[PDB]
Amino acid sequence: FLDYGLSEADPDVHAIINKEKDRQFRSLELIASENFTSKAVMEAVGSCLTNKYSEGLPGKRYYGGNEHIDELEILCQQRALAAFHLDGDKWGVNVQPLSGSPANFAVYTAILKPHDRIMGLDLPHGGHLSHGFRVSGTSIYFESMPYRLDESTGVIDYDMLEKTAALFRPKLIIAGASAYPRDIDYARFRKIADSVGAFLMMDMAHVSGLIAASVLADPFEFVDIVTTTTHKSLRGPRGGMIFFKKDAVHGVDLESAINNAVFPGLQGGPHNHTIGGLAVCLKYAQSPDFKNYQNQVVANCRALANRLVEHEYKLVSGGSDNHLVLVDLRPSGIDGARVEKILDMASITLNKNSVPGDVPGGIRIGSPAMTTRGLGEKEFELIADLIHEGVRISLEAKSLVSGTKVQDFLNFVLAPEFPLGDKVSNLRRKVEALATQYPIPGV
Amino acid sequence: FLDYGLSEADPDVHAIINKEKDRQFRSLELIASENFTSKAVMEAVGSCLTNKYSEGLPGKRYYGGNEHIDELEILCQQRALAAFHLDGDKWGVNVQPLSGSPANFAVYTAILKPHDRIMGLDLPHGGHLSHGFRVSGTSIYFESMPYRLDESTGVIDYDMLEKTAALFRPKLIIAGASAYPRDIDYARFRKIADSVGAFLMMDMAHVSGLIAASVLADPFEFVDIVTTTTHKSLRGPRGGMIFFKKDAVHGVDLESAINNAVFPGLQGGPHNHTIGGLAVCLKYAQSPDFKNYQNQVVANCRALANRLVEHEYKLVSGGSDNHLVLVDLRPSGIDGARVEKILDMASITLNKNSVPGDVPGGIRIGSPAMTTRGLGEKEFELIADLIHEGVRISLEAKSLVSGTKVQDFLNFVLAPEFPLGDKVSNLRRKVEALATQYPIPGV
Amino acid sequence: FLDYGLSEADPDVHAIINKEKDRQFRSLELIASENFTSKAVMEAVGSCLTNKYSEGLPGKRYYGGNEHIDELEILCQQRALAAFHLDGDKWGVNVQPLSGSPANFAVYTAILKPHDRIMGLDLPHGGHLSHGFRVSGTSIYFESMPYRLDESTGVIDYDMLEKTAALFRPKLIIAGASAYPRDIDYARFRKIADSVGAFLMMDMAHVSGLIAASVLADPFEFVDIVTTTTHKSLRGPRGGMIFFKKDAVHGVDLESAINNAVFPGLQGGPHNHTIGGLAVCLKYAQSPDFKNYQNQVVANCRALANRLVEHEYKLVSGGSDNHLVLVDLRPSGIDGARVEKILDMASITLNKNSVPGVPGGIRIGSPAMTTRGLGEKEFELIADLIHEGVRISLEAKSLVSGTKVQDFLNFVLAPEFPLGDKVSNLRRKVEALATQYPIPGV
C-alpha cells in the first residue's frame, strides 16, 4: 500500500545518488566505456515497463497481457536496424540480451557446441574478456586462442592471424576490441574467416555509435553477426543487442539459433524497461545531431592525442582513428596503475590498461562522455595538459615513495601526510573549474 | 547537447509506456512472477547510476571514480544480509548478477567444471529452465538429470530423488521451482546432498519475500548457496543475487569462486542503477509492513484456492502453502493454452503451465501483484469467480469451434465474427470494475 | 643373422614359459575368463603373419603387399558371421579390435560424441569396467550411469532400469556382464532402449561361445551391435570383434562409423597373427563338438553350483544359467580376497569378486577345466575341494590379529606359515584331480 518517492523512502540511497550525480558533474569523465545518457532514456528505464513478465518474442509470448510490450520490442528492433542502415530482409536483431557479455555468450551458444574453437584479440593487446582469456566464460566453455597486435607496432598482426587460423581452425573469429585505437580491416577478416570456413563476428561495443554515424567502416558489409552494448558510444541504457544475417550461413539459420540461445538458452524474461530506453536511444542514433556528435567525438580525441604527443607521450599504434587513445606510459618512466590513482584523486577519471609488451603500462582515455557535455577541441587540449600535470605529479610521487610496490605507492598517496597533496588539490581545482562550466544530461 | 524529456524526445515510446501503465491499472495481473515495484525503486533505477562503469568489487575496482558506487554496493550487500537475517561472518552476497538465470549460471561456473552433474526439478513438474531441460544453458554446458513430482500427487518425489541421486551422483542438487505450490523439505534435501557429497543450492526466486518475512521455512538453515531474482516476491527491480557460505564447503572457497564467476567470468561492469533499486527494495524488505504484505499474499492465495475448489477445480498438490496455485484444467475438460487466451482477452493476465501427467494442461495463478494493490481475501474470492466465468467461456468456445487444434481455437476467438465476444466483454467489464477500484504504485 | 629357437636364444624366458606350462597342468583353473586354446590357434598366432603392416580394410590398404592378409581378414569375417548364424546382408563384423575394451571403446567412438550418456551393469553387481560401471575410460570420456541387480533376487532390476533410463536418457544402453550368472532378457532391454531412443549393445565377451552353440538366447534377434573378446568362451586367441547391423540405426550407417572408429580412430595396423588364430577358432565354433563342449560347460557349472549349495554357500541369484557362479562368502564369515589367496596356494585358481551389498565373493567358472575333459562328477569334487579351502581360510583368519587384508597376505606368505600342512594336503587332492587330464597347447 505505501508508495513513497525515493527521498521519502530511502534518504541514504537518495543522498548517494545525488553525490554520484555531483561527482559526475565536477569530474573529467574520461573512461572510454562511459557516457552520459539522456533524461528520456532514464525516464523510459525508470518506468512501469519493469513490471511486465514477457518470455519469448513479439507475437510468440509465454504469458498474457503483452500487446504494448510487443509493440515496443518491434519498434526497438526496427529502430536498431534503421540506425545501422540495414535492410530487414537481410538482417534481424535481438534486443533482449542483458548486456554485452551475455550477448556474446548467446552467439557462442547459438552457433557453437561446447569446446568449439574461437579466436579473438588478446586481452593485453586490447581485446575484451568475453572474446577469450581459464578466466573468461568464453575460455571455460569453448577453446579460445588469442590473436595479437604486433608488440612493436600496436597494430593487429593480420599475417600471423592468417597463419594461426590455418593451424587452429576456429569455427568463429571475433573482430572487435576494448582498447584498440584503430579501425579494423574487415575485408582481411572475411578473407581469413573464409580460408577456414569460420563464422565471422564483430563485437562493436566500443565503436557502435561511430559505425552508425558512418565515421568508421561498416562491419555489416563483411561479417555474419554483430554484437554490441548499448551504453557506451550509443549513449543508451545498459543493455545489449545481437544483429544477424537472415540468409543461412554455413547451413545455419542464425535467426532461430540466436533467438533460441537468448531464450530459453541463457535468459528468462526480457528487461522491458531497458528495451524502452534502448528504443529511445536508437531514435536519436538516426538523427543528424547524433551524426554531428560522433564527428565531434573523433575530432576531440584527435585534439587530445596531438596535445599528448606534444608532451612527448607514446600512443599505442601511434595515434587513433576513433574515440579513444591508449597511452604507453613506460617510456615516460611510470605505469598506468600509479597514474590512474593520482588522476582520480584530482577528479580525472579513466582506467589503467595493459599495453603490448607486458602492473599495466598504460592508460586508456576516451572522449565520448565529455563530448556529450559540449567540450570541443580546445577543451580537449586543456584535458591533455591536465593529464600531463597529473602524470608529472605521479612521477614525482613515484620518485619520493621508498617502497617499489604499487601498494607502497598507494599507501603513500592516500596517507594524510602525503607531501604532494597540495599539487593534487591544485590540479583538482583546475579540473573542476573546467568540468563545472558544462551542463550534464539526465533526470 | 540536447536533453529532452521522454514526451519531448519520443512521443511514440511515451505513448506505449502510458498504454502499458493503463493496461496494468485496468487488469487483474495474476502472473505469479510479476509485481508492481515502488516509485522509489523506479527513481533509483532511472537515475545517473546508469552512467558509471565499475568492474570488480567495492574497494577492488578496475576504473577510477567509484567512491559512491562502492558505498552503494556495500550498503546493498548489508541490506540483503539483514533482509534474510544472516550473520555476515557466515554468509556473503554478490548483488551484481543481471538476473536470476545469469545468477544460477554464475554459481555453476563457480563450483562446477563443464559436464559436471546437476539435478533440479523437471520443467513439466514445476521447475525452472535454468535448473536443466539440449534446451537450457544448464543442460548444454553441464549434465543435468531431472527429479520429478509424483505424477499422482503433485508433490516432490523425495524417495525417488534419493535413489536417483545415489546412481547419478550429482555434484550439485538444486532445490527451488517456478510453479511448485508447496514448501520444500530442506532437511531431506540436505540428507540427500550429503549422501553423495553434493553441493546444495536453493533458487528462491519465487518465494524470496515469503522467506524474508518468515512465512515459509528458511533454506539458509540447510543449503550452501542461495540464488534469487529481485523482482517477483521481493518487489524490487529486475536483478539477481547470490548468497554463499563463507566457510569452505567441500574444500571450496565459495566467496572467491562465485565473485570470480560473476566477474570476470560471465559479466562485465555491474548495473549500478539496478543495484540502487535493489538497495531500496531490501530496506523495505526488513520492515513490519513488508512482513504484513507477505502474510496477506499467502492469505489471499488461500482464499482464491478455496473458492476455486468450490467451483470444482483440481489444484496440483491439492492446494498451496505459498503465493501461487497451479490449476489442473484437464479434469474440467480443457487445457491452459485455450483458457489463458480467453482470460487475457478479458483482462485477466496469467500463464498456461504444464501440470504433472503430460499443449499444457494448467494455469498458474499468483497473488503478489494484486495484493500489492490492496486486494484482500473477499476480492480474491471474486477473482476466482471471474476466472471461473472465463473458464466456462473457454469451455463453451472449445465446444463451438470446429477445428481441434489450439491454433484453430485461437483463430476462432480472435476473429471479429467471434460469437462469444459479448460474454468476453461482459466479463472484461467486471474485471476492470474490480481492478480500477485500487491504486497502482510507480512513478 | 642367427635365428635360434627360444630355448637357445633366451633360456630365462623359456624357463618361465616352462613354469607356467607346468602350473597350468597342475592346477584347477577356475577363472571364468580363462580357457585353454588349441595348438592350431597357437601355431597361427606364432607365425609370420606378425610381420605384415596392413592399415585400412580388405582391398583399401594404406600399404602395399596385402593380397593374402585381405584374404585372411575376409575369411575371418565370413566365419564370424557363420559362427553366430548371421545373414551377411543384415550383419557385418570388424575383426581388428585388439581386445574387448578397445572393441567397446571403438563402438562408443563410432556412434557417440564425447560426454554422451551410457548405461551398463554396475561394477559391484557383475559389470565390466568398460561399461556403465572416474575409474574406467568409458566414465572418463562419456557420461555413464549404472543399473544394478535387485540385491534380494540377484537378478537385473529391469523395473528400476526402465525408470532410471527414462530420467537419464542414455544414448546407449549396454547389456552383458563379467559376473552375471543368468541369461539376459533382451526383449525387455529392447523395450527400454526404444522408450528413450537409445542404441542397444550386447557385450557378449563372457558368454559368446554359449550363444554360438545356442545354449543361451541370441542377442542378435534384438540388439544393434554386439562386441566380444575372442579368448574366453570362444577359446580363441586374445583379440576382439564388433558385429553391427548393416541397415541404418537411428540415422547412423553403423558399418562406416565402426570401421572408421577402429582405424584411423583408435588403432593402427591390425594384428594379422591374431586374426589368423581367430579364423581357426571360428571354424571350430561351427562344429558339433563345440556345441557338445558348451553344453558340458553349463552342466559342469550346474553340478558345481548344486554341490556348493549342499555345503550351505549362497550363490548370487540362487544358481546359474551359464558357465559361472558367483558365491557370496559374507554369510560364511569371510571375504573373497582372503579365500582367493588360500585357494590359490592349494592350486585352485579363481578370483575375488564383488557381490550385491574388500570383495565379499568369489567367481568360479567351468570352461577351462571342461576343455581339459572334466565332467559333472569332477565338478562336484571341485566344489568339495573349494569348501575345504574356505575352511582353512577361516582358520587362518582366526590366527591373524590384525583386521587388514595385507596382514593376512603377509601371514600366509611367511615360510613359518602354521597351516602350511593343511594347504599341502589340499593341494595334493587338487593336483591329483588335475594331473589326470590332458592340456591342449603346442
Next chain:
Amino acid sequence: FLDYGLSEADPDVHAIINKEKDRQFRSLELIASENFTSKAVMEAVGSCLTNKYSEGLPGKRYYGGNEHIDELEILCQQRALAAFHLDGDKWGVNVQPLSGSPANFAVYTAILKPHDRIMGLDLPHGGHLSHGFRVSGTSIYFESMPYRLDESTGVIDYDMLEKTAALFRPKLIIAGASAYPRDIDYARFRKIADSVGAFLMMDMAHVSGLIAASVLADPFEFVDIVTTTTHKSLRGPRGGMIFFKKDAVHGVDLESAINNAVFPGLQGGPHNHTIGGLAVCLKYAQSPDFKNYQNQVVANCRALANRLVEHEYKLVSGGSDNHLVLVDLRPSGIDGARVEKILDMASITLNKNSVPGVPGGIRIGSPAMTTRGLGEKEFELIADLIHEGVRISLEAKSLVSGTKVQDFLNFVLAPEFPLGDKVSNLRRKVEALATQYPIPGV
C-alpha cells in the same frame, strides 16, 4: 578333445599363411614400419602364455595364479630399462599396452583431462594419426593443433612451433613421427615445452632401435615420457611400451597415473604371450650384433638415398639421418598411389606417403631387408629397381584417359593389362635379388 596341428585343423588358414610366407620371401619389403621378427619371438608369442588372465600389476593381481606372469612382466621391464640405458630410480616402464596408439592414448588419459591441448607433427608433414595431427581419437577426445615442416627445407619448423605453442598453450607437446627422415632437436623441444609449462613426450615407434643402439640422439636426456611400438625397428612382437620419469613432473606422479590409465582405464588383462616375445627382443636389443644391425640400417638407407638422388628424385629434407627416406614424386610427374601399386605388382612393397605441399610421395625404409642381410650395394640396386618401376608407372598413366586414381587401379588390375610384360620383367629382377637372402621365422 582333439589337438591337431594347423595344417590338419584348418588347411585354408594354413594355405594363406603359406602364401604370405612365400610372398615375404619373394619380395623386397620396403615398408619402413615392417621388420622380420625372430623364430624365438614367434615361439614365445605362440605359447601357453596366451591362456593367463592377469589384470593388475606384478604382485597386485585381480586374479589368482600369476606367480610366473609377474616374473615375466618384471623381467621384461628390467630389460626395457637396460635396452635404453636407463637408471631404474629415475625411469619406470609399463609393458602392457597392446600397441602404439593405445600406448599413446594411455599417456593422454594419464596426464591430461578431456579437451586438454596437444601439439604434434602434422599428418601430411610426416606425423602419426595418434599425435597432434576429426579423424584421430587424439583429435576427438583432446584439442590438438599441428606443427609442420618448413616446406622449403623439409625440417621441422621449430621457430614457428615456438610461436604457435606460445599462443595455443598445449599441455602436452609430442615429438616423433612416421615419416620424418631426420633426428629431432630434443633440447629445442625442451626449451619450447618449458616456455608454456607443457609435458614433453617422444613417440619413438619408428626409431626406437636406432636409439637403443645410440645411432640417433637419446630422447631420454630431455623428455618426460617415451612411448614406442615393439615391432618396427626393435624387431619384436606387436605390442607397445610407455617409459616415464619416476620424479614428479608438473606435480604429477607419472608412474601411478600411467599404470592406472592402462588398467583399469583402457585395457583389461595384458597379453602375456606378447610380453614373452617382447622380453626376448629386448634381450637381443642389448647385443653388439643389434648395434651392428642398426648401423647397417642407416648405411643402407644412405646408399639408397644417394642413388635415388643420382636418378634425380627429390628427397624430403635432401636425404636422411635414419632408416627411411621420403621421396617427393610430384617433380617427376606422378603421385605415390599410382607408383605404390605398380611397384607392388613387381614385388616392391612400400607405401604412398604425404609430403609437404592423393599423396605426392612414397616412403621407403631399410630395416626389413637389412635384417635379411642386404648391404649398401644391394640397396643401390633397389634404388635402380624403384626407378624402373616409376618409369613403368609414368608410362601406364599416359595410357589412362581418366584422371581418377580408381581408373588407374582398374586399368592395371585388368587381365588384358598391356604393360604386364614390363612389370614381369621388373619383378624377375626384384625376386632375383630377394630370393638370395634368408628370412627369419619359424
